[PDB]
From a paper:
The human nucleoporin Nup98 forms fusion proteins in certain types of malignant leukaemia, is a critical component of the permeability barrier of the nuclear pore complex and is mislocalized in cytosolic deposits in Alzheimer’s disease. Key to these Nup98 activities is its large FG-repeat domain with a high number of FG motifs. The most aggregation-prone segment comprises residues 85–124 (named Nup98FG85). All four fibril types display a parallel in-register β-structure comprising short and kinked β-strands.
To gain insight into the molecular organization of cohesive FG-repeat interactions, Nup98FG85 was allowed to aggregate in pure water. EM revealed the formation of well-defined and mostly separated amyloid fibrils. Using cryo-EM, we determined the structures of four different fibril polymorphs (pm1–pm4). The least populated polymorph, pm4, was reconstructed at a resolution of 3.4 Å and contains two protofilaments related by an approximate 21 screw symmetry. The most common motif shared by the four polymorphs is a 13-residue β-turn/β-arch structure. A leucine-phenylalanine pair (L91-F92) is located at the tip of the β-turn, with both side chains pointing away from the turn. The other LF motifs in the four fibril structures show a very similar structure. In all four Nup98FG85 fibril structures, side chains stacked along the fibril axes build glutamine and asparagine ladders (top). Most of the stabilizing interactions arise where there are clusters of two to four phenylalanine rings and one or more leucine side chains. We obtained values of approximately −20 kcal mol–1 per chain for the four Nup98FG85 fibril structures.
Residue numbers in the entry:
A (entry chain D), B (entry chain F), C (entry chain H), D (entry chain J), E (entry chain B), F (entry chain K), ...: 87 to 119
């Protein structure tokens, strides 16, 4: 009754977001001007 | 009764978002101007 | 009663989003102006 | 009673979205202006 | 009744955000001008 | 006795190469394996 | 007796190469494996 | 007897190479594995 | 008898290389594994 | 008998290399593993 | 008989290398493992 094990490797500029219960997770937003 | 193990490798500029219960996950949004 | 193991390799600029229960997952959105 | 193992390789600019129960998954949306 | 163990490796400029109950987690926001 | 002003707009994955005297300019070459 | 002003705008992943005298300019080469 | 002014704007992951006399300028080369 | 003024703006992950006399300038080379 | 003034602005992770006489200038090389 | 004035602004993680006579200048090399 669980997620499990989620990994990443050798990744430049990288964001993971881990939860049991996420509401609206996001990838980056706003780079540059 | 679970997700399992989800991995990535050697990926530039990479975002994964892992949950048991996601609502509206997203990839990047807003780069540039 | 599970997903299994979903991986990626050697992928530039890459987002995966993993869940047991996704609602409206998305790929990138908004690059450029 | 499961998905199985779905992988990708050597793919530029690539998004996979993995779930047991997806509602409305999407590929990219909004690049350019 | 848990998440599990989610790790990352050898990742430049990287933010993970881990919770049992996230509301609106985010990746970076605002780089540049 | 000149080229003039050559511009591009809102173009994904784009290379222009500008010169007074080009010899063998090229577009991309080698993507994938 | 000149090139002029060559600009680009809002272009993802973009390389221009500007010279008075180019020999063999190139666009990208080698992405992936 | 000159190039002129060559600019770029709001471009993700971008390389320009400017010279009076270029020999073999290049765009990216080798991303991924 | 000159290049002129070559500028860039609001560009993520960007390399320009400027000279009066370039031999073999290059864009990135080797990201990932 | 000169280059001129070459500038950049608001650029994340950026390398310019300026000379009167360059031999083999380079952009990044080796990120990741 | 000179380069001129080459500047940069508001650039995260940035290396310029300036000379009258460069041999093999380089951008970063070796980040990660």
């Amino acid at each position: 009754t669980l997620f499990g094990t989620a990994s990443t490797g050798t990744s430049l500029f990288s964001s993971q977001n881990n939860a049991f219960a996420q509401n609206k997770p996001t990838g980056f937003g706003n780079f540059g001007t």
